[PDB]
Design an enzyme around this catalytic site. Sequence first.
Site, PDB file in Angstrom:
ATOM      1  N   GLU A   1      -5.715   4.352 -57.714  1.00  0.00           N
ATOM      2  CA  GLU A   1      -5.030   4.470 -56.436  1.00  0.00           C
ATOM      3  C   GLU A   1      -3.600   3.893 -56.451  1.00  0.00           C
ATOM      4  OE1 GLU A   1      -7.195   2.475 -53.494  1.00  0.00           O
ATOM      5  OE2 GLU A   1      -9.087   3.552 -53.496  1.00  0.00           O
TER       6      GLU A   1
ATOM      7  N   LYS B   1     -14.276   9.297 -44.500  1.00  0.00           N
ATOM      8  CA  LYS B   1     -14.053  10.102 -45.681  1.00  0.00           C
ATOM      9  C   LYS B   1     -14.568  11.507 -45.349  1.00  0.00           C
ATOM     10  CE  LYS B   1     -14.675   6.317 -49.088  1.00  0.00           C
ATOM     11  NZ  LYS B   1     -15.635   5.591 -49.975  1.00  0.00           N
TER      12      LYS B   1
ATOM     13  N   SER C   1      -9.451   7.738 -44.721  1.00  0.00           N
ATOM     14  CA  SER C   1      -9.413   7.308 -46.103  1.00  0.00           C
ATOM     15  C   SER C   1      -9.281   8.443 -47.137  1.00  0.00           C
ATOM     16  CB  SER C   1     -10.615   6.393 -46.367  1.00  0.00           C
ATOM     17  OG  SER C   1     -10.866   6.130 -47.733  1.00  0.00           O
ATOM     18  N   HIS C   2      -8.534   8.130 -48.191  1.00  0.00           N
ATOM     19  CA  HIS C   2      -8.585   8.854 -49.467  1.00  0.00           C
ATOM     20  C   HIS C   2      -9.918   8.690 -50.214  1.00  0.00           C
ATOM     21  CE1 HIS C   2      -6.691   5.024 -51.557  1.00  0.00           C
ATOM     22  NE2 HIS C   2      -7.921   4.809 -51.126  1.00  0.00           N
ATOM     23  N   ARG C   3     -10.037   9.406 -51.331  1.00  0.00           N
ATOM     24  CA  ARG C   3     -10.988   9.038 -52.365  1.00  0.00           C
ATOM     25  C   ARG C   3     -10.236   8.619 -53.625  1.00  0.00           C
ATOM     26  NH1 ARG C   3     -16.273  10.471 -51.207  1.00  0.00           N
ATOM     27  NH2 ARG C   3     -16.679   8.688 -52.586  1.00  0.00           N
ATOM     28  N   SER C   4     -10.962   8.061 -54.576  1.00  0.00           N
ATOM     29  CA  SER C   4     -10.348   7.662 -55.828  1.00  0.00           C
ATOM     30  C   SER C   4      -9.866   8.908 -56.593  1.00  0.00           C
ATOM     31  CB  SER C   4     -11.321   6.811 -56.677  1.00  0.00           C
ATOM     32  OG  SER C   4     -12.462   7.601 -57.037  1.00  0.00           O
TER      33      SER C   4
ATOM     34  N   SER D   1     -18.799   7.874 -56.448  1.00  0.00           N
ATOM     35  CA  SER D   1     -19.892   7.207 -55.725  1.00  0.00           C
ATOM     36  C   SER D   1     -21.058   8.151 -55.442  1.00  0.00           C
ATOM     37  CB  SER D   1     -19.358   6.604 -54.419  1.00  0.00           C
ATOM     38  OG  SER D   1     -18.168   5.883 -54.660  1.00  0.00           O
TER      39      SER D   1
ATOM     40  N   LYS E   1      -5.780   4.506 -45.047  1.00  0.00           N
ATOM     41  CA  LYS E   1      -5.855   3.915 -46.370  1.00  0.00           C
ATOM     42  C   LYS E   1      -5.664   5.132 -47.308  1.00  0.00           C
ATOM     43  CE  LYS E   1      -9.634   1.928 -49.200  1.00  0.00           C
ATOM     44  NZ  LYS E   1     -10.967   1.177 -49.151  1.00  0.00           N
TER      45      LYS E   1
ATOM     46  N   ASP F   1     -11.207  -4.831 -49.267  1.00  0.00           N
ATOM     47  CA  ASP F   1     -12.464  -4.123 -49.476  1.00  0.00           C
ATOM     48  C   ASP F   1     -13.296  -4.941 -50.473  1.00  0.00           C
ATOM     49  OD1 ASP F   1     -14.585  -2.390 -49.647  1.00  0.00           O
ATOM     50  OD2 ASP F   1     -13.401  -0.573 -50.096  1.00  0.00           O
TER      51      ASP F   1
ATOM     52  N   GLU G   1     -10.843  -4.415 -53.609  1.00  0.00           N
ATOM     53  CA  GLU G   1      -9.443  -4.123 -53.272  1.00  0.00           C
ATOM     54  C   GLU G   1      -8.805  -5.137 -52.334  1.00  0.00           C
ATOM     55  OE1 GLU G   1      -9.499  -0.138 -51.614  1.00  0.00           O
ATOM     56  OE2 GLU G   1     -11.134   0.527 -53.010  1.00  0.00           O
TER      57      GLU G   1
ATOM     58  N   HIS H   1     -13.390  -2.351 -60.394  1.00  0.00           N
ATOM     59  CA  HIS H   1     -12.131  -1.662 -60.598  1.00  0.00           C
ATOM     60  C   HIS H   1     -11.127  -2.384 -61.508  1.00  0.00           C
ATOM     61  CE1 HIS H   1     -12.558   1.283 -56.926  1.00  0.00           C
ATOM     62  NE2 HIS H   1     -13.552   1.379 -57.786  1.00  0.00           N
TER      63      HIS H   1
ATOM     64  N   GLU I   1     -13.500  -4.641 -45.348  1.00  0.00           N
ATOM     65  CA  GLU I   1     -14.374  -3.487 -45.513  1.00  0.00           C
ATOM     66  C   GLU I   1     -15.530  -3.907 -46.406  1.00  0.00           C
ATOM     67  OE1 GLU I   1     -12.204  -0.126 -46.891  1.00  0.00           O
ATOM     68  OE2 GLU I   1     -14.016   0.895 -47.573  1.00  0.00           O
TER      69      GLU I   1
ATOM     70  N   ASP J   1     -18.151   1.232 -44.913  1.00  0.00           N
ATOM     71  CA  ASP J   1     -17.899   2.305 -45.901  1.00  0.00           C
ATOM     72  C   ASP J   1     -19.189   2.670 -46.636  1.00  0.00           C
ATOM     73  OD1 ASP J   1     -16.864   4.128 -47.922  1.00  0.00           O
ATOM     74  OD2 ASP J   1     -16.007   2.462 -49.053  1.00  0.00           O
TER      75      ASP J   1
HETATM   76 ZN   LIG Z   1     -14.800   0.855 -49.538  1.00  0.00          ZN
HETATM   77 ZN   LIG Z   2     -15.475   2.585 -57.553  1.00  0.00          ZN
END
Ligand SMILES: [Zn+2]
Ligand SMILES: [Zn+2]
Lengths: 406, 406
Positions: free
Chosen positions: A209, A320, A347-350, A41, A371, A244, A166, A157, A268, A295
């Site tokens: 993920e 994040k 949160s994680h990241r991808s 992102s 998450k 999401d 998501e 995704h 989200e 987000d």
């Molecule tokens: Zn998001």
């Molecule tokens: Zn993405």
Amino acid sequence: HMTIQKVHGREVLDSRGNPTVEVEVTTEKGVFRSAVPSGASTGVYEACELRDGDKKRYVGKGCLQAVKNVNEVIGPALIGRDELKQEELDTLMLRLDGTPNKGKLGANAILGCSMAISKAAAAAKGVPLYRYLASLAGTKELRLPVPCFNVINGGKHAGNALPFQEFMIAPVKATSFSEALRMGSEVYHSLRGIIKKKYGQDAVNVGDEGGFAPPIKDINEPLPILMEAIEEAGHRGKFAICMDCAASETYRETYCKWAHDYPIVSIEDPYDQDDFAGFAGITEALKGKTQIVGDDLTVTNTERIKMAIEKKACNSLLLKINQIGTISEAIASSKLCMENGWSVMVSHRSGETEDTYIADLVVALGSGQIKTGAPCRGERTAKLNQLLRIEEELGAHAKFGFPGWS
Amino acid sequence: HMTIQKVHGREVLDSRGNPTVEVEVTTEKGVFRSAVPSGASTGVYEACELRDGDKKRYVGKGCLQAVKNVNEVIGPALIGRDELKQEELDTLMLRLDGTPNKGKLGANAILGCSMAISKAAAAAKGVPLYRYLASLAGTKELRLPVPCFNVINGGKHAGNALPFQEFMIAPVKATSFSEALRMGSEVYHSLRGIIKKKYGQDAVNVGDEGGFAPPIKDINEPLPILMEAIEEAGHRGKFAICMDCAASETYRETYCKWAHDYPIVSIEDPYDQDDFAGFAGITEALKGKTQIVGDDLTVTNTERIKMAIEKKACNSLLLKINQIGTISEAIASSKLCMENGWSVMVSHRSGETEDTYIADLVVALGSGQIKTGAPCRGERTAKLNQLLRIEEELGAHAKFGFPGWS
Ligand SMILES: [Zn+2]
Ligand SMILES: [Zn+2]
Ligand SMILES: [Zn+2]
Ligand SMILES: [Zn+2]
């Protein structure tokens, strides 16, 4: 003698196979290693992720510059300093960079240093990381998070008809983290069954993920499919749904119909990242049933958050760490949001690594929400397992879950 | 005072979301934690993986019994013992179990203890794990492995027409591990490109080991596809191909045609697990061009290996630590095979964790060969990153690769 002896950065690979930055801070208590996550992102409001742009290494995605900044600029400044002084050292690194977006040194040079410092400090104090971070955050009660497991993708995704990014399942009526994790895994496995039977063997290959991208043509097979999965595994009534929308990628009543018909407790980015007025309307409309998570709205940005709080645009922060890039700043944003009635979902990241910092961080914030992936792929399960270890250290009276969803 | 203080087991999740066993051994040098991997395979010649068979937890896949065996039988026996005495302690645990297949205590109770002991011992000696294991193996020269990256599935591993299980790419002409890993990632990313363009967005979702399951109908698109990927990324001439036929799942000239037309340096299980005569023929036929790896043939079993050596059935051992279940036994099998002219390829399982033991183990054996996944998914990249760290500790004159393929 108790101070910082060595600071060293290196490139490592994330769970997508792209380089990122890992930092080791060495004290007489040992070697404390932290790696930085990464999203696809950008992100005009995010702290700057510095990439090499050398098309001959990793098609422009090298992190040698960020690593050099660690090795030759931040590291030299940290040697001989007291690792216990978190705020002081994070502020130091903010001032070393000197830019509002960490564009000079890179947020991906500073963050690894920030995290590894805190780990060296926790060791110096003789407590695990989550305890040390709880002291820094002034958190009165620790708690294990309900994990929100990414299970069906999702817009950009997946190649399917679905517009939103998501669908997550959350074991909110579990009474312990151990229980929550087994329930999540058990539903993930019956879901895999359901998908394999409808869409075939290849349909259960996984996204970044650990969740699935089944070829859903029917824009409402997914929510019924998730209820079916929850039933079959044996946990009727024990689960909620988190969504999401990542609605920017597409740019209210519909949201009401889904929340009314299904147990959706969280949505989200229901609107575009600048549709503050639309955000505010949905936050008011579902207040006390469905929380609304910022987000792309908030981007872990200090001024974006202050905006959102003032305009009541959302009531939950997606946190994040790499988007802000220091631990002192991340904690400050968590505290601010909680003070104004918000929840925080860490949160994680991808693009994740084997690093497990956000496990201790979510406990230390006591937010009740994380998450960090499906119960699948090691860069997700590393967090979930670290949460099992934290729970074991805390013992049987350790608090679990998000009070509002229990 | 320098001895074992505490031994504790717990269930954790593997990268497929199934429970496995993790063991911590605590000494005055700290807490040393090791987790056990798991395959979907069985395996009359494999050491016994003990599962609960309680259909109410993880549909019969709980590891509470194995964990109880750690906590109540092996642990109590290890307290107060000198962790430096690897052979003695592994033999202890063999004798505690008392069965040829570790069916009493479970190989998945014993192995975590074996690994965590060795880590506590390395710390007591003041050397990293790979160094300590090299002393145990009598390895004269350490070396970084060429990594064999799982990239296209594969028989029972995909819904496609392909009969054989895995196609791997191996950066054999890289001169350093760092280089090998970047090359592997760069080819993995162009391969993803090629697959996305031919077969679409959903086709680049990943299997258990991080590789792809594209819908190949043409049983020979895959090898050309891999050459295309190698070219596009920029590494023509720098890569070899490794295959796993897992031919049992289907039950010679064809093998010659592929090796002659492509740079295939390795073929694992080209025949059925009991077709010793067919194994022997292909080993002789491709001797010095393509090594033949025993997996279902040998199953890391001591008597199966002795058989294979005697009949010249293969010339490479796939080493799965959890299949034998002690570190002393795994090392002994590596040494034996190498003494009879064999290579050893250290291996993951499909069910991996964040554990990185096999990274130090492959270096410590100095085998030049590791199969630990695509450069994708954290339970694979955790190993690859640990190999980057080992290389960094060894410095610029550290040996890389498998001499025969360089
Ligand atoms: Zn998001
Ligand atoms: Zn993405
Ligand atoms: Zn299999
Ligand atoms: Zn095999």
